[PDB]
Amino acid sequence: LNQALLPTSTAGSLPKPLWLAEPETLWSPWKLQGEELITGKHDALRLSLQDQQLAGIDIVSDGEQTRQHFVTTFIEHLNGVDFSKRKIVKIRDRYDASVPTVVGPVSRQKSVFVEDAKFLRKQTTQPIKWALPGPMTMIDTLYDDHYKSREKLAWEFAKILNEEAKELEAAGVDIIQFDEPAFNVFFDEVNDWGIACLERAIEGLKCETAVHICYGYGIKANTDWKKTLGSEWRQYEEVFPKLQKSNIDIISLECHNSHVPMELLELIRGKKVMVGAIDVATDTIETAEEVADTLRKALKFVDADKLYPCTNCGMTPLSHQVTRGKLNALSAGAEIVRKELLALR
Numbered sequence: 001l002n003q004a005l006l007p008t009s010t011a012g013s014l015p016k017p018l019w020l021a022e023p024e025t026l027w028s029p030w031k032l033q034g035e036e037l038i039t040g041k042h043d044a045l046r047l048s049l050q051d052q053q054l055a056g057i058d059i060v061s062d063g064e065q066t067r068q069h070f071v072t073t074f075i076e077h078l079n080g081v082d083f084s085k086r087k088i089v090k091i092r093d094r095y096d097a098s099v100p101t102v103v104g105p106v107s108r109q110k111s112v113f114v115e116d117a118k119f120l121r122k123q124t125t126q127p128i129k130w131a132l133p134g135p136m137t138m139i140d141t142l143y144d145d146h147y148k149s150r151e152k153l154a155w156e157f158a159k160i161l162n163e164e165a166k167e168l169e170a171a172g173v174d175i176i177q178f179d180e181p182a183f184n185v186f187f188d189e190v191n192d193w194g195i196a197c198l199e200r201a202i203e204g205l206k207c208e209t210a211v212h213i214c215y216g217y218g219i220k221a222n223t224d225w226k227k228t229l230g231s232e233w234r235q236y237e238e239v240f241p242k243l244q245k246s247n248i249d250i251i252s253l254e255c256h257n258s259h260v261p262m263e264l265l266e267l268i269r270g271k272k273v274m275v276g277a278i279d280v281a282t283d284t285i286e287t288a289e290e291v292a293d294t295l296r297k298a299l300k301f302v303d304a305d306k307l308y309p310c311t312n313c314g315m316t317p318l319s320h321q322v323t324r325g326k327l328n329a330l331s332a333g334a335e336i337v338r339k340e341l342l343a344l345r
């Protein structure tokens, strides 16, 4: 039996084993190749699942253990993409990254994560949440040397995502999450076509869908950026009204230690809300009570049966020890509030 009230989850990614990849980095090269890597990825999935279960996470992910990066791995499996043709581009309208190049017409040929999801589905009866990159974030994490159009390419990616997502649903995934950190930047594009591309990505799915929009991984570039954002981070106000009208079921957001006004959650009243109650941009471990405090504040704007305690973003850049402490705090804080709501203490 699954957790009916305040079920916990994370944004998706968790640290990989030392023998599989370099610690505490983004885009780590794989330390195994060939059949050893095939086995290692699945063993890492099993170990990550166990870590999530031990920490009391109710809705589990792959720990993103089988991918190098939450955006570029998916892109690299597509036709029309040159994996080893790298360019430095400014991503998120702000900072530089080494990204793959679109060299021709894009298409999905073989499935990407479906065999992984079938494998994970056999390991547990708990709900499974699998993240894919959203169409906008995809076009913002590559160099387009063919379409020469963010919108045209994003449309093609929406179609491809829909194919992958539908097959992940067939594999038994319960929640398909689309990672759209780009939505906290490109407001005009979100309004003109980003929502439409997200709708195309989710068309015909019967499982629950989520969109994740945050202020990024725990890296210096982002913590520096946060220091410039002022007293109120109101980026969500630009996109929440349209997300409210969309067919997305769950909105995953950053909240803990942020300056996002909590009353912005009223704009999505009726949606399920994955409320980030863990700051993945500090190594300081939250107390259970600090997590509980964020969840209590969120209950002013979200019905208890729609509140999904979560992390502000993924944890692949953190150490295993920090991650363990944070996930334990998340589950412990959720339980504090769950017990209050049920008059158990």
Ligand code: MET
Pocket: 010, 011, 012, 013, 014, 064, 070, 131, 179, 181, 212, 214, 216, 217, 313, 314, 315, 316
């Ligand atoms: C910068 S958005 C990253 C989201 C991704 N699903 C993760 O958990 O890492």
Ligand SMILES: [Zn+2]
Pocket: 011, 181, 212, 213, 214, 215, 216, 217, 312, 313, 314
């Ligand atoms: Zn994020």
